[model samples]
Target: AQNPNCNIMIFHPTKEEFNDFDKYIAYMESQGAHRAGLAKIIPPKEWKARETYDNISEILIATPLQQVASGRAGVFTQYHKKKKAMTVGEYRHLANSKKYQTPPHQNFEDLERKYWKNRIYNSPIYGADISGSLFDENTKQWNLGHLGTIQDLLEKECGVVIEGVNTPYLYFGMWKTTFAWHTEDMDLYSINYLHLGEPKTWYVVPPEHGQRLERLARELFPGSSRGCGAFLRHKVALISPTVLKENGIPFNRITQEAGEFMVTFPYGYHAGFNHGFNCAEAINFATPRWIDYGKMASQCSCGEARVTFSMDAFVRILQPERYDLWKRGQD
Candidate 1:
């Protein structure tokens, strides 16, 4: 029997097919949320590269951009420092005007190669609260056929405050830009949607072996577990899947394409590199199955604790009636 919590599955559904959101949730729950997976919903014709670029460019042009510092070894290995900040328009003008180069480049590719090599620009298009963002509104309309998601239902029906857990983060990546090996906060569920540009290659370790992998990481690089920022600051060393395979730690790779959504289950360790220029959005969610893990994760040693729905808070707010029933039964 397939391990319900550690397997990986992929689904491709037409836009119409994806309209049945409840069916998707049922399938996910049946398989268990501990399994990582990908869901590719057929994109609209207008979601092509050019159209996506135009829409994203419009939003970016109006927003300010922050610069990520670079070094000889590369930015991925260096601690990121945001030094200069400029509007997206100014940044684009600099790229087009060849201000970073000694001579004008023949094409955008050459310019992108040199100008974006050591640096990246990223910003959240929407805040974690997502109450009034354009994406939030669009998501509600898009998924209205089957009502909202479990996370959404918790917030709307049960009055659960998901502001911290449902935080959405956006990334605008350049060539070779990377996210180092780490699990999502509180070992919670996460979904990453590739909005546009080149594919991202991911290396994932299943939840079952996450502890072993962490031990191996610490053994290989002592002091890696020192503090919250140690992993990112310590050369951003990604644990090699090859090394893990040699040692009998199973892993999988996925090259996420544009318009595809990648989901990571609780405690699944993941890291990836952007193949080229691209943009993606990611957010976290919690289900009934996640309660135990969240409780345990609250005690794990790591960076600054990300505020998530505590077990006590969830019981007090959303499950008080059930608690009362249990108490009455005990009496």
Candidate 2:
């Protein structure tokens, strides 16, 4: 299970797994989920700027990074105090325009330059403390808002059971990329899915030697080029099953499930790609972290600590009150 190449574990959720969404709400209430505003995102267009907003309903919401920066909600509104000037459809078109696409680049520096050039910065407006365009050098192993958005949305929408406590589960989701690869950051755990079309992801490392993982990851998959060492970069990572098997790494049997899958452990050294036309999407989820809760506290001294402890205590103190709901096993 700890092997560098076979570090991932996947599972499915039964209808019973999510039967207690309301029960979770109640537990959250008892544990002070009521006080902590979980990050919640609504499509910008669907959001209402009502005179009186519901505190309980308002969690940190997010739109695409591009939308928050260039669209009306972003610079447009910063210049003009206006709301809903453009429809989502119109905005999507603008965001997806060829003008916004990042140009092809061989190195990380160039990629970062292209990413920011196209305006891919994190927004603090929707609860992200760090806002403004993101630079490649600024990349951190773990991102609270990006990760939390996935976790909250998955729990509210799919009800996946987050394994363990203290450490957060890996939040996995479906995504399509024409060509991409990564040097795993030691600080975070990541697991992605390839549901449709053709996309291949791969991982590897010296089985016993843990140090220099980053050096190996970077040297093998240099910022400027792809594919090196045993860690296979984009060119090799995304080949079809046939190509992979021919190359001695047969990873064809991997199947896509209806829900999401997660891998929480931080085992760095991996890469992936989409070679055939456009790539496909996959189920993605992550390890749940106490920091995620801390991020939700919104300047509270305890950050996520208070909320997690409160919930833990509530589970014990209000056991009887929560038993019926717990019986349903809703996460």
Candidate 3:
């Protein structure tokens, strides 16, 4: 029998079928792919990657760095640092070209590999903005914000530009570097496209299991849970699927190869590591029907340090007729 937790829906859409990106994604989510909390979409190979990188602006890693802890080596620690600024070319060269002199060990290769892994994992650039240069706007129909209907919902309705939320953010990753377990900002739907390079492996827990995942994470990292309801944002802990499976949480382990799309449903707790160096771009979005999730998310945050994008603005946009009443009651 196949393991249910490992089964994730993979879609291969023909040019004609895929042209309406929102239509097919809506259909797929409605068809039960959402139960897995994530879907892997492989584009028609005929549509080649047309991404370009810009080096005009300098950026640094804003993501928190982690180190595999002692005794519990499987668990990582979340700590802070002010990363130095560098251009895209410098960052890319550091990830791909820098040479290292690893400590000698009985197994030279393993020693060298582990040294490199920890070094790169210390410096990850997860949210560099290249929206100005990554995609030729005309060629990127799959841009989640650019999708015909959702575009209207965000730009035309939300009436705001929230970088890395309504706007796109670029990601550069290297071997064994990871993003910790967390959902998208504002509990919004997120779509990520791998423009080039090696595959990325993702581990996702369904909406139904989000609570369970959080419970287990809290049990694993009680320190963060002590202060924050959204402890996953601590961005330090990582528990492999094998241990989670043994603990009885349902999850799917899947890989997104180059030129593939990874769609994360709202409230989907997902995390994973890069196989090697890769370039990707992602943006968060919402539909008219997503107001409830936004409201629910707002009601739930108390200790979270990350600010919630004001639902007030979007709510009024969605229901201008009730803006006065909504405003009065919320205040």
Candidate 4:
């Protein structure tokens, strides 16, 4: 299917009563269902400020909001950088070298241009270029691209089936841009799952909760989210996502996760971290494939192709009206 409608999935325990699906369905109550979307498959590392490998759940429960919001949200994951395990000095040197091309600004447009250039030269971030197909030979599973791995991770972890989307172009390329906030033009919903790294600062105001603060920031800063644009003298915050909702009351803050229940972002303004101390990395899979805008609106739309942001979208879609206790200005 080119465009997949969002749906939800619920898991019932054996203790719920009724052995068959029919009986289980009739007997099950709302409490047994865990409103799904954005499940935490892998949590963040414990050590704040620096990168480290640890359990995912531990990172989420421990990290403080201050550090999450104002701290390490913009730092790039050393995931691929770690395979070779280059030291900071060595990594710096390589980044400065012609091979990596570390320029003054590393924005989405710049990175996309570089990625296209590299692709033309058959130079992927990892693995050899094997684009051509042998007419006589059947395609092998292992031969799939890095995009496949990303898709697999989403499917295995979240159980989302994305339609008509390729992994290589979306996850590794366009989605690489981290921590920038902007909302879709159409009516849609997103469930964000975050695994806390260190004690990061994160604030989330439900729709219409912090309009005064948002308006004040916009006016005084003139296009800045919070103090980021003012501090950096740029139009947008460096690592924050601004969610502009259809209703004037948008949400502006960090959403760590929706444990057992999904949090719906009704149109509003939202933002996140700026400082090194308050940083976070997240995997977001939004649904409805442009409920507000058409396919041309975003490369994320994947040419009117129906796709699940992640496999977990199915679980959340099933229970579309999951309530969120989201009060404005919780912090």
Candidate 5:
């Protein structure tokens, strides 16, 4: 009854079939893969990551220990909660220790560390975050550039530095390191690449089930849920699929390995944990058609920081581009 296999669309594109990343992903979406919230794509066998990343030694780690000596978050135990800053080397050692240690808590007890320290907290490698970012050459093909939604509209004028939306953020995790259920900012679709390390399991709920999830969270985390237009944005709630299905909500799971990619659809709810020590990077993007979803994604969903970004402006800017393309269909 644990870890059921409702496989998300798994595709292993050979060099012959993997010509274009965006094209292939769009094709998959057309085939209804997004109904499951995510899909896994493993690149060709000959492909290997040569991004040349040196060993890192930084982390503003968070902990969600619930065990007695393991640590506690005030009174109510939290899942993957916070409180730790340490070297990646030591954290790896701790990660290794927890794996071999019998009781799990013993690893933390010996270190004299009050809280766990392994989740890297979506750390960024800006220097490399989106190196090939927008559109450049083969090396930069994945272009945060091809995010196309904005680029097609603003052309060169879109210079706003939208953190992980245009850039990328990295993550490190082992055993229990986790990210809670939530949609991407602006509810835009996002692509996550697990560059190296062990597989991470992602649990997601389809976009149509968004409201169902909101009801469940509100019923469970009444106070916290009431604070945000969407409580999952709090990034603290954790619910099992078992609980989800019990409430008549649909969900899916994908166990993603290194060198593979995972994409979360607009408004889809996703959360998952790392199987062991691993590194992954993610960024958000929208399609020309995403305006429909954007309209439903309320500003208050983020609880207001003055709403620096505007989809309405994007739409205004997008119309002319759309109009020009329509007339150019010389077929």
Candidate 6:
């Protein structure tokens, strides 16, 4: 029997449901998704496998090569760098052709072992790589038109100088490509749209039990340097949902299929592995309700880069309006 306390929900939004953006947002918010939620939509006609890669190749071929790594870990800064910086085309071929050697894995344990052995590689295409900015004028056409309501508002009000939150990053993963356990930055919301490829298996820990899981990681891997603390940054600590369940922590697992958008709520710890070569685009955003938690996450020791849009800046922009409302209440 499945855990009765599991909070994960999956919604198959019809074309009409997908079209009603406001209702969609309301439904998502109403669910109070602690671990994660899935909304499977009909992807755009152009988002097909071959066409998607072709569209991506155009961006890759044009962008200049900067230092990026090919590793199992999602956090690139903590991992050792690959020696050569190749164009997008070069990297894409290597990935699509299965150029790297990876061990076969029958289960999660084998998957983790292969990850630690550096058997997988990913081509992380950043927003800047598309054009001089986060959203290239051309690439913008490829995105889901209705997706960024709150993010667009933030960009306009906060000024375009802010990156990361508004600017998305694309992930192209081959076999065994893994992202370690971590929550979204600043307790913000994240939506990942799997444009093409095989399913990605996700293990998610609900927000309510986030601290408890962290404490357990500390207790379990006390002597290791990259154990608990590295969970903040770096990709070293990868916890299995099975281990979490053994310790009585509630978690949910989902095999995210293509044409699906996975939404992770504030402070929800999620980790996953790609079944095979695939492409996905992800970005973060903050809703009005996320203000308090975002502020707390920004100040917390979460291994999040301080340079990513600060909560202070967000509050500063809202302060004048909030002050006026408070003063008007006195009248």
CA lDDT of every candidate: 0.50, 0.27, 0.62, 0.26, 0.56, 0.54
Residue-wise C-alpha lDDT for candidate 3, range 1-331, written one tens digit per residue? 2224535788888877777776887777666777787888888766644645444236444442322332233455534343555555555565564441123345434533353345434444333334532556666557544654343566655575432224667776665556678886556788898877766778899876789998888888786677666667555567766568778988887778788998888778898876556777787766554555654552223334333245455545545665565455445
Highest TM-score among the candidates is held by which one? 3
Per-residue C-alpha lDDT of model 1 across residues 41-119, encoded as one tens digit per residue? 3444333322224544433422323223333322222234443444434433443343231234565445334433433
Which digits, one per residue and each the tens of the lDDT, describe model 4 over residues 191-297? 33222221212333443343443454454334233423222212133222222332243333322321121223333223332211111222222333222222222
lDDT agreement of model 3 with the native: 0.62
TM-score of 1: 0.63
Off by over 4 Å in 3: 1-6, 49-71, 97-133, 148-165, 298-304, 308-331
4 or 5, which is superior by lDDT? 5
Ranking by TM-score: 3, 5, 6, 1, 4, 2
Tell me the TM-score of each prediction against the true structure: 0.63, 0.27, 0.74, 0.28, 0.68, 0.66
Q: Going through the candidates in order, what is the number of backbone clashes in each?
A: 0, 21, 0, 54, 6, 0
**Pairs of residues clashing in candidate 5:** 63-81, 64-81, 125-129, 133-143, 133-144, 134-145
> Which consecutive 10 residues in model 5 have the weakest lDDT in total?
121-130
How many clashing pairs does model 4 include? 54
Show model 6 residue runs off by greater than 4 Å: 1-4, 20-22, 35-53, 61-80, 96-165, 220-231, 234-236, 298-331
TM-score of model number 3? 0.74
lDDT measured at residue 11 in model 4 versus the true structure, 0 to 100: 35
- Per residue, candidate 5 scores C-alpha lDDT tens digits across 97-131 of 74422223444233222222332322211111222
* Residue-by-residue lDDT tens digits, candidate 2, 64-102: 221132231111111111233333234334334454322
Instruction: Give the lDDT of residue 107 in candidate 5.
Output: 41
Residue pairs with clashing backbones, model 3 = none
